[PDB]
Design a binder for this molecule. Structure first.
Ligand code: HEC
Ligand code: HEC
Ligand SMILES: C=CCCCCCCCCCO[C@@H]1O[C@H](CO)[C@@H](O[C@H]2O[C@H](CO)[C@@H](O)[C@H](O)[C@H]2O)[C@H](O)[C@H]1O
Ligand SMILES: C=CCCCCCCCCCO[C@@H]1O[C@H](CO)[C@@H](O[C@H]2O[C@H](CO)[C@@H](O)[C@H](O)[C@H]2O)[C@H](O)[C@H]1O
Lengths: 106, 103
């Protein structure tokens, strides 16, 4: 987590972020919020855009390090991603499903 | 465990992509007959993503319950969907700009 290239910088952010984010001061919102000064300004706190209620469980402002963890799997925090392919949040639900599945599949 | 509530969970949450009876067809996901006590990625007639190659398990109730807390994280490309980058020297490459363009 030190430095990096700038020319692939514009490319990588254009390859993987431009579709959902702008950055320049006063930039428009997209499907995702504009990122002007994402440091200092607390996380999930861009005016003109209210977030999913995931910002309420995890919200410590990003830095050079702990944000890099967010770009490993940002979808982990987007709501409905668990449920998509059969995710069950409640353990009693997983218990009941596994109870049924053990007998139905054998 | 209520198998009665489990049946209803499977009907509304899993049946859209899986069958469970012996000889059942594959759908978007594989037929689940015999899943317990076999390894991930082994249903006959279904060809899987590469997820199970490096994440291989012998299905039991412990790892099934863990898996079912979040199956999407093993679907290849779900992490990339919202800006996931795999290799460490690529996040480090582009957060150092994210500090520049903030200014
Ligand atoms: C569309 C699929 C997106 C892509 C590609 C990327 N991001 Fe994203 N991001 C998106 C949304 C819809 C949201 C909001 C989530 C919510 O709960 O409302 C976000 C959020 C962020 C944040 C948090 C900003 C804050 O105000 O705290 C950051 C820092 C962020 N996104 C950065 C980011 C980067 C660097 C990306 C390229 C690797 C990227 N996102 C891709 C939508 C999408
Ligand atoms: C479509 C949107 C799905 C829903 C809804 C559920 N599952 Fe699924 N499942 C799906 C796919 C495409 C795959 C294969 C993934 C791959 O990497 O190829 C799977 C896999 C499973 C497995 C593993 C199968 C095996 O190893 O043979 C299990 C045990 C499983 N799925 C169970 C399951 C349950 C219990 C669900 C309801 C809670 C459920 N899945 C929903 C696609 C989809
Ligand atoms: C708009 C939405 C923005 C949502 C904000 C999410 C920001 C979180 C990014 C990672 C920073 O969070 C930091 O890493 C993980 C993620 O929970 C936490 O710990 C984690 O460790 C393990 C990983 O080895 C995980 O399995 C655990 O579930 C988690 O507790 C740390 O306690 C926290 O210090
Ligand atoms: C085919 C498509 C999907 C492929 C991707 C499958 C990914 C599922 C992985 C879910 C992680 O679940 C995890 O499985 C491991 C290994 O089996 C379990 O490990 C545990 O049971 C194993 C049984 O020998 C032993 O290693 C120990 O008892 C313990 O490590 C974890 O306690 C469980 O928390």
């Amino acid at each position: 987590f030190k430095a990096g290239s700038a020319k692939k910088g514009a490319t990588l952010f254009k390859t993987r972020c431009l579709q959902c984010h702008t950055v320049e001061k006063g930039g428009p919102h997209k499907v995702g919020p504009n990122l002007h000064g994402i440091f200092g300004r607390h996380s999930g706190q861009a005016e003109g855009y209210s977030y999913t209620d995931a910002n309420i469980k995890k919200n410590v402002l990003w830095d050079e390090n702990n944000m890099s963890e967010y770009l490993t799997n940002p979808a982990k925090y987007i709501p409905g991603t668990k449920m998509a392919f059969g995710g069950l949040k409640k353990e009693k639900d997983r218990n009941d499903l596994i109870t049924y599945l053990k007998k139905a599949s054998e």
